[PDB]
Amino acid sequence: NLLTQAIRQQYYKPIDVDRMYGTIDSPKLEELFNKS
Amino acid sequence: FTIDDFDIVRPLGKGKFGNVYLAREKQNKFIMALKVLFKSQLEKEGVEHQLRREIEIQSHLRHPNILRMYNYFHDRKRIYLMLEFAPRGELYKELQKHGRFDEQRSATFMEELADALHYCHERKVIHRDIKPENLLMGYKGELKIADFGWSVHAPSLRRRTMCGTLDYLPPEMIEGKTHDEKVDLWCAGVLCYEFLVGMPPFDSPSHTETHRRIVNVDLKFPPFLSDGSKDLISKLLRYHPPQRLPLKGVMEHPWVKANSRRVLPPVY
Ligand SMILES: CC(C)NC(=O)[C@H]1CCC[C@H]1Nc1nc(Nc2ccc(C(=O)N(C)C3CCN(C)CC3)cc2)ncc1C(F)(F)F
């Protein structure tokens, strides 16, 4: 399967998750139970 | 982020306060786990501040043996947690399948656990609930601490909350004393024993007898255990918290050095 290969590829070729996801703005913890 | 930014592959199971799904983030084709929590359900159960603390702790930890929380987002009805996908799943299922782990597997998990807990402790984070059920396994079977339900950032490092799981409770919690980060050293010892034996060391027919065995440190080693594994467990399972073997000591223990096959995952 293409998924099993992609999972193996992710282990050997890790991405910069800190830049790709961490840098993107997040909702305030106090806002999580409020309006979107 | 929105749920439309992800392609849901399949469900992975039911978590404590929500279902988990295997998903792929569309922009980067990156495979991750998505934990879906319902805002109304969490508010009704009154676990809002509990979830906030768990997210606050986990989202700021970056270690190969701690499950990563990449980010989080919310919509009208749901809160979504973007989490690292652990391909080999639940550690407790593997332990139940094999009955007990061999020395190589147990020592590897002990080195990974001690390294992850050391990283927590150097940030004044106490886990307080180390047990097989709170651990996942990576692509190469690497241990991943994946629940922070009882965790606390303790700057004064002196707490009173009785927490965790019956078989893993340290004597100081049972006796109603104050506790510190050394509770994690005790739990690491119980975990090592459970990995090698398949049962926790103070297993009893009643909660009162389990409490009694714990506070007396009524440790009875099965004869199949090696001298090295018994030495490490005995050094962790000390009645007095200051006498417990430090996490650096676990990583340096000769039984860990001789049997661990720890592999650090590739990094960016
Ligand atoms: C609190 C504690 C840590 N547990 C949890 O959070 C639970 C809650 C539900 C699932 C899990 N959470 C996660 N699970 C994974 N991976 C995983 C899980 C299950 C399997 C699997 O189905 N099998 C191996 C097999 C497949 C074949 N069948 C037949 C048996 C099981 C394979 C991979 N990655 C990340 C997470 C996370 F945490 F990010 F949400």
CA distance B49 to B42: 10
Q: How many CB atoms lie within 10 A of CB B170?
A: 26
**Residue-range domains of chain A with CATH:** 1-36 (1.20.5)
Tell me which long-range contacts A17-24 makes (C-beta under 8 A, separation of at least 24): A17/B68, A17/B70, A17/B268, A18/B62, A20/B28, A20/B30, A21/B70, A21/B71, A21/B82, A22/B70, A22/B71, A24/B1, A24/B71
- Residue B130 contacts residue B187 (beta carbons within 8 Å): yes
Cβ-Cβ pairs closer than 8 A, A with B, add up to 66
Residue B119 lies in a domain: yes
* Long-range CB contact pairs, A25-33, < 8 A, 24+: A26/B71, A26/B72, A26/B73, A27/B72, A27/B73, A27/B74, A29/B52, A29/B55, A29/B56, A30/B52, A31/B74, A32/B39, A32/B48, A32/B51, A32/B52, A32/B55, A32/B72, A32/B74, A32/B79, A33/B39, A33/B42, A33/B43, A33/B48
Among residues B89, B114, B134, the one where a domain terminates is: B89
User: String of b and e for A4-35 (b: at least 16 CB within 10 Å)?
Assistant: eeeeeebeeeeeebeebbeeeebeebeebbee
Sign of the dihedral through C-alpha B200, B157, B163, B95: negative
Residue B74 burial (C-beta neighbours within 10 Å; 0-12, 13-18, 19+): buried
d(CA B201, CA B193) in angstroms, rounded, equals: 7
* C-alpha closest to that of B27 among B6, B48, B8: B6
Element (DSSP H or E) covering residue B24 = strand B19-25
Q: Is residue B220 part of a domain?
A: yes
Whole-angstrom Cα distance, residue A29 to residue B43? Answer: 14
B82-100 CB burial, b ≥16 within 10 A, e <16: bbbbbbeebbeebbeeeee
Domain endpoint, select from B41, B56, B89: B89
**Rounded to an integer, what distance in angstroms lies between the CA atom of residue B130 and that of residue B236?**
14
Residue with tokens 């992710």: A10
Measured in Å, residue B221 CA sits from the centre of ligand 1 at 32
In angstroms, the Cα distances linking B114 to B106, B117, B250, B253 are 12, 5, 6, 11
How many angstroms separate the CA atoms of B59 and A36, rounded?
A: 20
3-state secondary structure B64-107: CCECCEEEEEECCCEEEEEECCCCCEEHHHHHHHHCCCCHHHHH
Is the distance from CB of B143 to CB of B119 less than 8 angstroms?
A: no
As a whole number of Å, the end-to-end CA separation of chain A is 37
Cβ–ligand 1 contact at B34 (below 6 Å)? no
Residue of A10, A12, A13, A28 to mutate, interface with B, max B Cβ within 10 Å: A10
B210 Cβ partners below 8 Å, 6+ apart?
A: B166, B167, B202, B203, B204
Instruction: Return the amino acid letter for B75.
Output: D
Tokens of A8: 């193996």
For chain A, give the number of residues.
36
- Going by the DSSP 8-state scheme, the letter that residue B179 receives in this structure is B
Q: Is the CB of B11 under 6 A from ligand 1?
A: no
**Eight-state DSSP code of residue B138:** -
List the CATH number of the domain containing B191.
1.10.510.10
Is residue B267 situated within a structural domain? no
Domain interval for residue B34: 1-89
Question: Domain of B5: which CATH number?
Answer: 3.30.200.20
The answer to whether the beta carbons of residues B101 and B193 sit under 8 Å apart is no
Backbone angles phi, psi at B166, to 5 degrees: -35, -60
Tokens of A5: 């290969």
Whether residue B202 is contained in a domain is answered as: yes
**Technique that determined the structure:** X-ray
Q: How far apart are CA B105 and CA B259, in angstroms?
A: 8
Are B28 and A26 in contact (CB < 8 Å)?
no
Q: Which of B60, B89, B118 is the last residue of a domain?
A: B89
From CA B255, how far away is CA B233, in angstroms rounded?
11
Question: Residues B146, B137, B238, B102: what is their CA dihedral angle, to the nearest 10 degrees?
Answer: 170
Same domain, B205 and B115: yes
Sequence-distant (6+) residues with CB within 8 A of A23 are none
Quick one: B72 and B140 in the same domain? no
Q: Which residues of B are catalytic?
A: 129
Q: How far apart are CA B127 and CA B120, in angstroms?
A: 8
Give the count of domains, chain B: 2
What Cα–Cα distance (Å) separates residue A15 from each residue in A21, A27, B266, B267? 10, 23, 10, 8
SS3 B159: strand
